[PDB]
Every structure is written in C-alpha cells, then in structure tokens.
Design a protein around this ligand. Structure first.
Ligand SMILES: NC(=O)c1cccc2c(O)c(Cc3ccc(C(=O)N4CCN(c5nc6ccccc6[nH]5)CC4)cc3)oc12
Ligand SMILES: [Cl-]
Ligand SMILES: [Cl-]
Length: 240
C-alpha cells in the first residue's frame, strides 16, 4: 500500500486511470500538497478567481488540490535561463491523459508531423495569463468535470509582441519569446512576486491594443529549457 499522502495518491490514480507508488516514480517528479491555508495557496486561488475570462462562461472553476512540483533535473536544465529578466508564472492546460508524459518528459514542442492548426505563432510551448483560456485545453465535460492545469515559471526575457498569426522560423535577435497581444489583460498594477516570479493575477482590463486577432494574451517559448514547472492544480469544472 502507498506511503504517499492521500491527495497525491488520488492525483496518481487520475493521471494513470501497477501500484500507486510505482506509478509515482514513473513521473520522475517531486509532488507536494500545498496547504489550503498557506500564502502560496491564497495567491494561486486569487490567480484562478481573477483571470477567468468573461467569454468562458460555460463553467466556473473550483481549486480542489494545489501541488508544488519539481521535475527531476529540470533545475539544472533551467540554469541557462535562471536569471533572464521577465520571468512569469503562467497557465498551461492539457488533457488528463497527457500528464504522465508531461511530468515524465516536461512540456515539449509538437513534432514536425503534427498539424500547426491551433498554433498562431507556430510550434512552441504555449501559456496564458487567463486561467480559463488554459483550462479550455483540459477538454473536461459535465460527465468528466475534473481537470489538471500547470503553473510554469516561463523565462520570457525580451518578448516579440504580435497581434496576428505568424509562424516565425526564428526569433529576432535579442528576443527570447513571443507574446500574442490580447484585447483583455490582467491589470499590470496588480502584478505580485512569488519566489522572484511575476504573477499577473490582476482582474482583466482592456489592454488598449487595437487591430488584434486575440481576445486574451498568450506567451510562447521555442526552447523547452525556458520552462520550469512549479505547480499542478486539480480543478473542478462546474458546467452551466
Ligand atoms: N495549452 C495551453 O494552456 C495554451 C495556452 C495559451 C494558448 C494556447 C494555444 O494556442 C494552444 C494550442 C494547442 C494546444 C493543444 C493542441 C493539441 O491538439 N495537442 C498538443 C498536446 N498534445 C499532447 N499529447 C501528449 C501526450 C503525452 C505527452 C504530451 C502530450 N501533448 C495533444 C495534441 C494544439 C494546439 O494551447 C494554448
Ligand atoms: Cl480550446
Ligand atoms: Cl523558432
């Protein structure tokens, strides 16, 4: 029987759908329950509450469990980007069935033989600052209403800021990432700092960006090493 805390056991059962502890080791990821009443937990629940987009009104989100995560060696891997400026705690949603691969291998760029459909800026690693924009990629339903979402520390550095789809072959010199400029943005004045990482948990305001394809921001890096996965949330989707 398992010596993991019950919430981590339930995460494992959800991810693998072998014994629980053997399946834990296959993730090559240190997993800790964040306490409900911790400051970390308050900040993350505030990020969820404030960055639910008005146009994503099919469901509300409740945070069941928050996990602090540490992929084996992802530290050493993140070293070259560790002190790059403009490091941001951003959402990445994916189907539950993907999380064993995501924790064991990290987030990866789609292979050349996958469609570029859905990628406004070409194959890369995509993040949102709006929880619901990322939560939509969990593909939960009323009959499967529990999903998994990541918070990554993303080393954005100098952002190549774009308003329309463009499959860039190469970042301009001195740029580290792409930011797709949305009509709606977390209020920059409400940004807070968690462990030297910027958290844009401000409620959505008009960006005052005109002539843009995007309702909401998105952030893209083309190097797997610019991502340090920090948290994994188990979300209840309440469908209306
Ligand atoms: N995701 C965001 O939070 C997110 C945040 C902000 C903006 C965007 C934006 O435009 C996208 C694009 C997107 C997502 C998904 C897919 C898609 O169909 N797949 C990619 C993931 N696959 C996959 N199977 C896996 C199995 C094991 C291990 C890893 C695996 N990975 C399935 C195919 C296409 C485009 O996403 C955005
Ligand atoms: Cl979607
Ligand atoms: Cl590129």
């Amino acid at each position: 029987k398992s010596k993991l805390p019950k919430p981590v056991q339930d995460l494992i059962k959800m991810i693998f759908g072998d014994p629980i502890d053997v399946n834990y080791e296959k993730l090559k990821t240190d997993i800790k329950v964040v306490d409900r009443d911790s400051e970390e937990a308050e900040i993350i629940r505030k990020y969820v509450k404030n960055t639910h987009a008005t146009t994503h009104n099919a469901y509300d989100l409740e945070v069941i469990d928050i996990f602090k995560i540490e992929r084996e060696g992802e530290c050493q891997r993140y070293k070259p980007f560790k002190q790059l400026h403009n490091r941001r705690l951003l959402w990445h949603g994916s189907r539950t069935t993907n999380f064993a691969g995501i924790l064991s291998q990290g987030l990866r760029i789609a292979p050349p033989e996958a469609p570029v459909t859905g990628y406004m800026f070409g194959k890369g690693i995509y993040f949102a600052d709006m929880v619901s924009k990322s939560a939509n990629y969990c593909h939960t339903s009323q009959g499967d209403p529990i999903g998994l979402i990541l918070l990554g520390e993303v080393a954005l550095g100098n952002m190549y800021e774009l308003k329309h789809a463009s499959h860039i072959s190469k970042l301009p010199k001195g740029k580290h990432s792409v930011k797709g400029l949305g009509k709606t943005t977390p209020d920059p004045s409400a940004n807070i700092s968690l462990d030297g990482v910027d958290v844009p948990l401000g409620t959505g305001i008009s960006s005052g960006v005109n002539d843009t394809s995007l309702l909401y921001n998105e952030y893209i890096v083309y190097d797997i090493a610019q991502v340090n996965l920090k948290y994994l949330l188990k979300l209840k989707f309440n469908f209306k």
